[model samples]
Each structure stands twice: as C-alpha cells, then as structure tokens.
Target: GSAMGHMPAVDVEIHFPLKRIAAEGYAEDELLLNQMGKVNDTPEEEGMPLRAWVIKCAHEALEKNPKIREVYLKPRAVKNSSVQFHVIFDEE
Candidate 1:
C-alpha cells in the first residue's frame, strides 16, 4: 500500500505566564506593595516542567488532527519562564 496526500506545514507558538503571588496564601502589605509596578517573570530555567505540560496539551490537541505529521518543537530566544516555544507540524 502507498500513501498519497499533501502535508501542509504549520508553526505554533506557545507562551506561558508567570505567577507573582502564591496560589494559596495571604499577601502582606509590604510584599504586595513591593510587587507593584514589577514584571514578575518566571525564570526560564524553571519553566521546563511547565513547558512539558504545555507540550502535552499541544499533543492532546493535535491528536484530533490525525492528518498532522512530522511534528517538532523549537525553543525561542527569550528571558524568564514566560517561555516561547515553536511547534511545527504538517497536515494532509
């Protein structure tokens, strides 16, 4: 058997946000004030876990597109865990 079809390539970029406050905790007045006017960007080095989670989500989404093929992930140049990732894939 032979497969015949055209596969179109697609590039997807994923971005993540950082947490400035604890998920479950009370913020002190001083800390809250200090956080004002500050860009709370998570460290890129610590974004691996989150990145993996995002990748998994992407995979799940792509699963519905069975035509997708030759998928690949490329990391973009940026600071902080607010990471930028490129996902390339082909569809027929």
Candidate 2:
C-alpha cells in the first residue's frame, strides 16, 4: 500500500511537558491564582518547563525557513486552565 500526500521526510516528535501542582485544600480561586503566579514570575528562563516547548518550536521554524526575519511571542490566559499564545513572524 502507498499513501499519497506531502509528509515529513524524517520522523519528528513534539514534546509538551505538564507538571501537576498539588491542589490540597485549593479552591477554584486558589488554583487559578497559583497557575497565574508561576506565569507571572517566570520569564522564559533556560530549562523552565513552561516555556521550553514554545521556544523549541519557534527556533525550529526559523531555522527551516530563511524568510522568517523575526519571531515574537505574546502570552495570554483565557480561562482557568486554558492558556493561549500568539506567534508572529516577519516576511519579505
């Protein structure tokens, strides 16, 4: 059998790490505050698990495509456990 579609020439895997936070006696407000605190305190330090996956993807894309002149990241939180981010690139 043959599959007919554009596919990656080599195998690639993306890893997203999630660490569980202890929630003992934590109400909804406490849970939300705890997560937000970490996001606010950390600023993309090396080996910081929160930003590891994102930084990796950004670097890879810029490497593969030379046209990518600049990369930008915008962090946003939409809900209690749902977070969103924006990635922007410059083009010719």
Candidate 3:
C-alpha cells in the first residue's frame, strides 16, 4: 500500500513536450532565399503540396530541356539560391 504522504521508489514521471522549428523539407527553405535575390514575382509557397506541384513541374522544364540544364538565373521561380548550377556548355 502507498499513500501521497509517503511514496515508494517509482519511475520519475517527467515529460518533455517541445516544439522546435527546424529544417522543414519538400522545397521549404528553397523559397526563402529566392526572395533575397533582387525582386521576385514567384509564388513563395512551401510544404503546401498542391501549390508546390504545378510550379515545381514548370521549373523542371527549364532543366529537363536535355540540353538547356537547370538554370537558377532567377528573375522568377525555381532558381537555386544556395546550391550552384553552372551552364553545361560554353565557348564558341
């Protein structure tokens, strides 16, 4: 038998519920730096699945041209800010 006045050895009842804002995935951080490059007309949406799809596909077209390659030559969306994309071909 146990009472509140005198309790036997028991597991320490402690819980930690914390909310930490860390690196979120699925093109989340991508949109952030995009705004930093000059002015942007691109829709800065991330983690939002529906909006992400259409824009992502369109941007892929810029790269998947098989010859053109991924161009972060930002004046709009899909420009890689941190990572780098060098033009595949050069010189004449």
Candidate 4:
C-alpha cells in the first residue's frame, strides 16, 4: 500500500514549438508560392500570403526610412497562424 494521500512522481511536460519565417523580396521570388507550385493554398485566397504581406509592409516602411537593405522573418505562435517575413537595414 502507498502512504497517506501521496501520489507517484510524474514526468514534467514542456511545450516549445518552433516557427521559422523566411524573408526575401517580392521581385526576387513569389512569396505566396513555392518551387513545387504548392502555393500557400491557405493564404492564396487572401490575395497573398503572410510573407508577401511582410514584404509590402517593409517596402512601405523603407520608403519612409531609406537605408534598409535586407529583411528576415522568424516563425511565430499564435491563434491564427501565418508565415512571416523579415526586413533588414543597412549599417549606418
């Protein structure tokens, strides 16, 4: 028999999901679709995918603030998930 009101040890659980967002230019490549022609089917209906949105956003931002060179996006965790893009700036 076990001791009074004592429970056995259980494993501790930790959830660490990773999300990687790649960044690039809209002209360089089509951000909405991939080489396999597997368009971001989920986002295509929305006109463009997250990555493209990011690019457009960056372009708008860069217009105001020149010197921007590159941009990169990382994976994210959220209720409604979407691919992310990045924006990098040149060194002053």
Clashes of each: 1, 0, 0, 11
1-92: candidate 3 lDDT, tens digit per residue: 45568543222111111110112342344432232221223223222342344334434543356344223322123442332222122111
Descending-lDDT candidate ranking: 1, 4, 2, 3
Model 3 — TM-score against the truth? 0.21
In candidate 2, how many Å is residue 46 off?
14
Candidate 1: regions farther than 4 A off: 1-45, 69-83, 90-92
Model 3 error, position 22 (Å): 24
TM, every model: 0.29, 0.30, 0.21, 0.31
lDDT of candidate model 2 versus the reference: 0.35
Error (Å) of candidate 1 at residue 6 is 39
Q: Can you give the lDDT of residue 40 in candidate 1?
A: 26
Task: Give the alpha carbon lDDT tens digit for every residue of 1-92 in model 1.
Answer: 27557433333343211121222231332332233212124524335454444445445545556444333443333333334444433221
Query: Candidate 2, residue 78: CA error in Å?
Result: 12
Question: Can you rank all candidates by TM-score, best first?
Answer: 4, 2, 1, 3
Error of 3 at 29 (Å): 3.8
Write model 2 residue lDDT over 14-80, tens digit each, in one string. 2211111112222233423343344434433222443444445554655567454444443322122
RMSD of each: 16.3, 16.2, 21.7, 13.1
lDDT of 3: 0.28
- At residue 86, candidate 3 shows an lDDT of 24
